[PDB]
Amino acid sequence: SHSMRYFFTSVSRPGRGEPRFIAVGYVDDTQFVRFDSDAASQRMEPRAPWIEQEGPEYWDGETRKVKAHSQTHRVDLGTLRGYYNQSEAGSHTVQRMYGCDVGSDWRFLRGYHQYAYDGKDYIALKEDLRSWTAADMAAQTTKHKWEAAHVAEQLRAYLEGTCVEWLRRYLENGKETLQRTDAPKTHMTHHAVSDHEATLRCWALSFYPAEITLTWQRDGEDQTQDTELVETRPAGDGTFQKWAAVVVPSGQEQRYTCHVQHEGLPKPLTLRW
Amino acid sequence: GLKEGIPALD
Amino acid sequence: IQRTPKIQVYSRHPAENGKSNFLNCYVSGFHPSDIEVDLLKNGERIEKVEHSDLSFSKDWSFYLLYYTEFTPTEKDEYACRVNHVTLSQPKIVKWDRDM
Numbered sequence: 001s002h003s004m005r006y007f008f009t010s011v012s013r014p015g016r017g018e019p020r021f022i023a024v025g026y027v028d029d030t031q032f033v034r035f036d037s038d039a040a041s042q043r044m045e046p047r048a049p050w051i052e053q054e055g056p057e058y059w060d061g062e063t064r065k066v067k068a069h070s071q072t073h074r075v076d077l078g079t080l081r082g083y084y085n086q087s088e089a090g091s092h093t094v095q096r097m098y099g100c101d102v103g104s105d106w107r108f109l110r111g112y113h114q115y116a117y118d119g120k121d122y123i124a125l126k127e128d129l130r131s132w133t134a135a136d137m138a139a140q141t142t143k144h145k146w147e148a149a150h151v152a153e154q155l156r157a158y159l160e161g162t163c164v165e166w167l168r169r170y171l172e173n174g175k176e177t178l179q180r181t182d183a184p185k186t187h188m189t190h191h192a193v194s195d196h197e198a199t200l201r202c203w204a205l206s207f208y209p210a211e212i213t214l215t216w217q218r219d220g221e222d223q224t225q226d227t228e229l230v231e232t233r234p235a236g237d238g239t240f241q242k243w244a245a246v247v248v249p250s251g252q253e254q255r256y257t258c259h260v261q262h263e264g265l266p267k268p269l270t271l272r273w
Numbered sequence: 274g275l276k277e278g279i280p281a282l283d
Numbered sequence: 284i285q286r287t288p289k290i291q292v293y294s295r296h297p298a299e300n301g302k303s304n305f306l307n308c309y310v311s312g313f314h315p316s317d318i319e320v321d322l323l324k325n326g327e328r329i330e331k332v333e334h335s336d337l338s339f340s341k342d343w344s345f346y347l348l349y350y351t352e353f354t355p356t357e358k359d360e361y362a363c364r365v366n367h368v369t370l371s372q373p374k375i376v377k378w379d380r381d382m
Contacts, residue, residue, distance in 0.1 A: 006275065007338045007339060009316060009337055009338075009339065009345075011315070011316060011317070022336060022337045024336045024337070024338050025275075026338075031335075031336065031338075034336045036336065047336070058274075061274070062274065062275055065274075065275040065276070065277065065278075066275060068278065068279075069275065069279055072279050072280075072281050075281050075282075075283075076281060076282045079281075079282045079283045080282070091315070091317075093314075093315050093316065095339060095343055096279070097339075098276070098279075116343045118284060118314075118315070119284040119286070119314040119315070119343045119344070120284055120343070121343075142282050142283075145282070145283065146280060149280070151280040154278075154280070155276070155280075158276045158277075162274070162276070163276075166274040189381070191381065201381065205297075230291065231289065231291070231311065233291055233293070233307075233309045234307075234309065234335075234348050235295050235307075236295045236305050236307055236348065236350050237295065241293070
């Protein structure tokens with residue numbers, strides 16, 4: 001399973017000038033391109049070595065296209081302010097995500113195109129890539145207009161065809177990293193809270209992709225009481241980190257086992273103190 | 274690669 | 284909508300005194316996007332602090348990684364200070380070795 005995803009945020013600046021626009025591109029959990037209106041180049045920039053392989057015609061295209069995306073969102077911010085009957089004094093946010101998934105065969109699996117205003121669902125293309133999920137009556141108006149203009153049909157042609165063609169190209173060219181898994185480097189730590197009570201903490205580091213499961217079990221039986229899970233987090237170097245802890249009576253540490261599932265492990269690992 | 278054009282709301 | 288940021292502060296690699304490393308402050312689950320994140324060494328603001336490109340999760344909330352190079356010691360305290368419209372006053376999370 002693989003994906004390509006583009007994320008766009010536009011933020012109106014009522015004090016002066018035009019909205020802040022930030023675009024980012026991903027293949028699975030690897031960011032590969034950026035654009036930022038506040039940045040000085042006014043180009044789509046590379047963020048992974050394997051996309052720097054692309055020639056100038058690629059960078060001119062993506063820059064032209066991303067600037068046109070930027071304008072579309074500027075205009076959208078105006079439309080929405082009118083629809084929701086808001087003043088020009090407030091700063092508002094528009095966000096768009098689109099992209100495609102492929103299965104292990106590299107064939108079209110799924111498509112995406114969804115949109116939010118001030119952080120709430122507005123309009124989304126449904127799984128079939130033919131109909132829409134409008135959240136409220138403003139979005140309903142957009143739904144009727146987009147149906148009339150055959151927007152679904154146009155997005156479908158990209159997401160089913162051209163989108164997967166790029167993803168395929170990128171997967172080949174980035175195969176040394178994008179198609180390599182990095183298994184978690186695991187270990188455990190002990191923290192005496194008192195004479196009676198102690199904390200075991202089970203660590204997963206330097207792993208890719210981000211998807212991982214850490215579970216504790218006491219005496220070979222899943223335990224959720226007295227545990228904690230932190231959200232999975234980026235190391236900074238393209239890999240991720242996570243941990244899980246459990247509070248345990250002092251001297252009972254050997255009952256408890258940490259279980260680690262991840263794509264880069266052929267079998268799940270088990271750890272014990 | 275980005276789509277050639279995205280729909281405006283209006 | 285308005286969601287408060289979740290904050291994690293941690294080292295990229297396991298921490299050893301006198302060994303160069305990266306101090307991270309991951310902020311996530313927040314809205315709107317405008318936010319202030321500072322890394323602190325014994326209370327003072329660190330100056331060459333870089334950050335990731337704005338993005339967001341399935342629920343539209345944003346996340347950012349703020350990071351800088353550093354060489355820990357036994358004495359030096361490190362922390363992330365975050366300010367956002369959802370917060371009464373800036374929130375400050377101290378870095379633990381249980382990172």
